[PDB]
Amino acid sequence: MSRLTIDMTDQQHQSLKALAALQGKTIKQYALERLFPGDADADQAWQELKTMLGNRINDGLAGKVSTKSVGEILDEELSGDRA
Amino acid sequence: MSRLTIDMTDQQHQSLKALAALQGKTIKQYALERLFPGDADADQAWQELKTMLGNRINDGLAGKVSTKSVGEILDEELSGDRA
Numbered sequence: 001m002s003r004l005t006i007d008m009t010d011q012q013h014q015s016l017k018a019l020a021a022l023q024g025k026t027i028k029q030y031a032l033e034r035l036f037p038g039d040a041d042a043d044q045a046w047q048e049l050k051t052m053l054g055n056r057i058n059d060g061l062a063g064k065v066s067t068k069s070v071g072e073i074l075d076e077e078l079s080g081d082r083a
Numbered sequence: 084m085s086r087l088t089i090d091m092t093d094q095q096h097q098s099l100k101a102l103a104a105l106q107g108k109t110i111k112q113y114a115l116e117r118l119f120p121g122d123a124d125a126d127q128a129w130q131e132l133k134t135m136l137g138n139r140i141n142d143g144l145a146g147k148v149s150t151k152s153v154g155e156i157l158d159e160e161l162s163g164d165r166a
Contacts, residue, residue, distance in 0.1 A: 002096035005088045006111045008118075013085035016118045027118075032089050035099040035114045 006031075049073060054082055 008016070020030030051070055073081065091099075099117070103110030137154045155165055 001090055002093040002100075003088060003090040004096060004100065004110060004114065005086060006115050007084055007086040008115060010085040012119060013087060017087070027087060028089055031087065031118045032091055034118045034120075035091075035110075036095060037117075 045078075052081060 016031055016034075017027050020027035023030055050073065052073070053070075070082075099114050100110045103113035106113055134153070134155065135157055140154055155161075
């Protein structure tokens with residue numbers, strides 16, 4: 001486990017420490033990713049452009065259903081298709 | 084002293100850890116500021132300021148065949164992509 005110890009100022013530590021919890025996690029993760037923050041944009045559009053889950057609730061629940069529709073999408077819009 | 088301990092993965096920690104020394108300091112400084120980064124000018128300004136006059140191009144190459152993904156020669160009719 002590559003654990004690094006970083007020295008910070010009591011005042012600043014509250015800025016990042018609080019932010020970590022504010023985001024919904026612990027600095028141990030938040031600060032960690034901050035050192036390696038890439039671009040989630042590229043992994044956002046394609047996240048649905050190739051496989052859109054939608055915004056509906058469950059309807060059966062049984063492991064995983066092989067969607068016959070989703071998977072084959074083409075140019076037409078940026079946000080929608082199946083709402 | 085507000086010193087925070089963080090757990091990172093061997094391979095990844097080397098990416099940021101090494102960058103610290105590569106820049107001319109210890110990750111305890113480099114990674115530290117990375118947690119408190121706030122700028123939107125140099126991010127785009129320096130992103131292109133170096134895109135022109137690089138630092139290490141090596142007289143070896145010349146024809147270019149994709150490998151570095153960074154570095155171009157101005158004053159020359161080329162295709163799009165990088166414009």
